[PDB]
Amino acid sequence: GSSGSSGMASEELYEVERIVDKRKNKKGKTEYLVRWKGYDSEDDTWEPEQHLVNCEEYIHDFNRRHTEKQKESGPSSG
């Protein structure tokens, strides 16, 4: 299905496009490499999962990619 419906935005700062990387800070904080408008590919920044609120989806998806063998595949019902 399609998961990503806008809801009360009205000119927002920046919407998480997707995760390109993820790591922990020397402090021990989890940071996920997410892109944003204006920021080129090599301009991408690092945001802590904390700042990434309601972005679990993306991260989750991104995590799945990295993860090796975890989620089961299914056919297409309709």
Outline the structure in words.
- It comes from Homo sapiens.
- This is Chromodomain Y-like protein.
- The protein has 78 residues and is of the alpha+beta class.
- It has one domain (1-78).
- The chain contains 1 helix and 3 strands.
- A 3-stranded antiparallel beta sheet has the order 1-2-3, with helices on one face.
- A hairpin with a 5-residue loop joins β1 (19-24) and β2 (30-34).
- It starts with 18 loop residues before the first strand and ends in a 12-residue tail after the last helix.
Present the secondary structure layout.
Blueprint: E1 19-24, E2 30-34, E3 45-48, H1 56-66
Antiparallel strand pairs: 1-2, 2-3
PDB class: structural protein
Keywords: National Project on Protein Structural and Functional Analyses, RIKEN Structural Genomics/Proteomics Initiative, structural protein
Assembly: monomeric
List its salient traits.
78 residues; 1 helix; 3-stranded antiparallel beta sheet; monomer; alpha+beta; globular; 14% helix; structural protein
